[PDB]
Amino acid sequence: MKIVYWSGTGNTEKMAELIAKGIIESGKDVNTINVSDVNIDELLNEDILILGCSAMGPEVLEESEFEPFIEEISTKISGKKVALFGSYGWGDGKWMRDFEERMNGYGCVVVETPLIVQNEPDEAEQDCIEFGKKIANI
Numbered sequence: 758m759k760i761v762y763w764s765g766t767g768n769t770e771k772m773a774e775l776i777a778k779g780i781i782e783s784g785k786d787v788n789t790i791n792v793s794d795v796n797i798d799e800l801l802n803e804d805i806l807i808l809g810c811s812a813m814g815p816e817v818l819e820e821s822e823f824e825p826f827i828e829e830i831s832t833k834i835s836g837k838k839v840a841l842f843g844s845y846g847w848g849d850g851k852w853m854r855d856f857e858e859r860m861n862g863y864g865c866v867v868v869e870t871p872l873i874v875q876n877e878p879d880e881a882e883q884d885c886i887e888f889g890k891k892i893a894n895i
C-alpha cells in the first residue's frame with residue numbers, strides 16, 4: 758500500500774508513520790511517500806489511495822505542492838477508494854470537510870471518516886494506528 762502526504766512541520770508526517778505502523782501491524786506492507794516524490798502512474802495502480810495534508814492557508818489544501826497533485830490525479834480516480842487524514846491548528850476541520858466533498862465529487866469512495874488531529878498526534882497516537890488497521894481491513 759502507499760501513503761502520500763504533505764507536512765510543513767512534521768505533524769501530518771508523524772500521523773502518516775503511525776497510520777503505516779497500523780497497516781504493518783495488520784500484516785501488510787506499506788510505503789510512505791512525501792507528495793514531492795510521488796509517481797502518479799505507480800500510485801494509480803493502488804486499490805486504495807491514502808492521502809494526507811495539514812490545514813494550510815485560509816482553510817485549504819497546501820497550495821504549492823499538494824493541491825496541484827490533487828488536481829493532476831482528479832480526472833483519473835473515479836471509482837477508487839480513498840482514505841484521508843491530516844493535522845490542523847485553530848480551525849475545526851473545514852479544510853477536511855471540503856477535501857472529502859471534493860474527492861467524492863471526483864467519483865471516489867471515501868472508505869472511512871477522515872482522521873484529523875490537532876497539532877502533533879501525541880495523545881492521538883493510537884487513533885492513528887487504529888485508522889491504519891481499519892484501512893488494512895478494507
Ligand SMILES: Cc1cc2nc3c(=O)[nH]c(=O)nc-3n(C[C@H](O)[C@H](O)[C@H](O)COP(=O)(O)O)c2cc1C
Pocket residue numbers: 763764765766767768769770810811812813814815816817844845846847848849850875876877
Ligand atoms: C500558513 C499557515 C496556515 C494555516 N492555516 C490553517 C487553517 O486555515 N486552519 C487550521 O486549523 N490550521 C491551520 N494552520 C495550522 C496547521 O494546520 C497546523 O499547525 C498543523 O499541525 C500543521 O501540520 P504539518 O506539520 O503536518 O504541516 C496553518 C498553518 C500555517 C503555517
